[PDB]
Design a binder for this molecule. Structure first.
Ligand code: 4V8
Ligand code: NI
Length: 329
């Protein structure tokens, strides 16, 4: 078995010629050659069994990604884990290999207005499907937006996905709602326009300050909803902040792109634009095609209350969910 950065990757004999992609808290992504399909694939190693929260994420992503089928959403082609539950410490999720991600692309490339428009369309087409299944992604960021050589976009990382970095987090998450994904897509749109994050806060306080520095001081109506007391008081203790017009921050940006940006980056989630209205925005006219925008057959529903389940039980559910990919099923 191969070793990638002192981490073992037990995916052989089928998957070999491993190469590092990235890593998180309890997982590592590599690329490898599939000796059956004769292509390179992406493999995601997960070690979640010590924590209940990590077990919940793993099971949700596996369940959601195996039911969904849409061009702009990553699937699961294969899953590797030990023959027995006692020996299963890791789960390897095999997925389509893409050329890069938006995080990497925005670090080296300046995007044309037509490419910002096209990438934005595919995010919203993907999210149109997700939201139609009554699911929120809850963690849309440039690293979760995969791109291939022909500019096809796929949304990955459904660990935080639920049935309806802090830089892409909606203010209502920071002040205690498919609207949270729209906020993230708004942040991503702004980063595509300038190659830098619009709200790069070092901490939540710095995050809220970055937000108010552009949007201006929140209105009474915006501070009317259920809000955390510490957060509400903090905002009430701040000196007035003026709203910075969108053309001052993005002088070169397409005004239609700035109209949609404004509607997505709305403090009040109840006043924020929805996915379908965003797809119909004049800015996405050249790509908008409701004939070619699939929705889910029925809303996604989990059979069990996963949050209440002990980590040992979640492991069993994971073992059963992953059984269909084992030889002799
Ligand atoms: O869940 C996923 C799946 C991911 N990928 C799998 C599919 C794919 N195809 N092409 C690529 C790619 C190709 C070239 N450059 C970058 C990416 C991926 C990346 C990536 C991130 N995360 C979040 C994560 C990672 C580790 C632990 C926990 C969470
Ligand atoms: Ni292209």
């Amino acid at each position: 078995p191969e070793m990638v950065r002192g981490q073992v990757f037990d995916v052989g004999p089928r998957y070999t010629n491993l190469s590092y992609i990235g890593e998180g808290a309890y997982g590592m992504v590599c690329s490898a050659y599939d000796n059956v399909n004769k292509v390179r694939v992406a493999i995601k190693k997960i070690s979640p069994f010590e924590h209940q929260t990590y077990c919940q994420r793993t099971l949700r992503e596996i369940k959601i990604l195996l039911r969904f089928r849409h061009e702009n959403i990553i699937g699961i082609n294969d899953i590797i884990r030990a023959p027995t539950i006692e020996q299963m410490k890791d789960v390897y999720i095999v997925q389509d290999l893409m050329e890069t991600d938006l995080y990497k692309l925005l670090k080296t490339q300046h995007l044309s207005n037509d490419h910002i428009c096209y990438f934005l369309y595919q995010i919203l087409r993907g999210l149109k499907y997700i939201h139609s299944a009554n699911v929120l992604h809850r963690d849309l960021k440039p690293s979760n937006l995969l791109l291939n050589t022909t500019c096809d976009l796929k949304i990955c990382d459904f660990g935080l996905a639920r049935v309806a970095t802090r830089w892409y987090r909606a203010p209502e998450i920071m002040l205690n709602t498919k609207s949270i994904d729209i906020w993230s897509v708004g942040c991503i749109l702004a980063e595509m326009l300038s190659n830098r994050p619009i709200f790069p806060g070092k901490h939540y306080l710095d995050q809220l300050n970055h937000i108010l520095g552009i949007l201006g001081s929140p209105s009474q109506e915006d501070l009317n909803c259920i809000i955390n007391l510490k957060a509400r008081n903090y905002l009430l203790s701040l000196p007035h902040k003026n709203k910075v017009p969108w053309n001052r921050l993005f002088p070169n940006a397409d005004s239609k792109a700035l109209d949609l940006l404004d509607k997505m980056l709305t403090f009040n989630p109840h006043k924020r634009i929805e996915v379908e209205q965003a797809l119909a925005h004049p800015y996405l006219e050249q790509y908008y095609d409701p004939s070619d925008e699939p929705i889910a057959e029925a809303p996604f529903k989990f059979d069990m209350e996963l949050d209440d389940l002990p980590k040992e039980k979640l492991k069993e559910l994971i073992f059963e969910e992953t059984a269909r990919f084992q030889p002799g099923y």
